[PDB]
Design a binder for this molecule. Sequence first.
Ligand code: ZN
Length: 36
Amino acid sequence: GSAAEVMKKYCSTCDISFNYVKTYLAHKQFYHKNKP
Ligand SMILES: [Zn+2]
């Protein structure tokens, strides 16, 4: 699922897509990280 080199700009958990790696990062840091 991770810790290697999987996925790119799409969330399998939220079934969402991103046209920019920056967005996929912002989603993981914002959506899956609301208290870093
Ligand atoms: Zn997600």
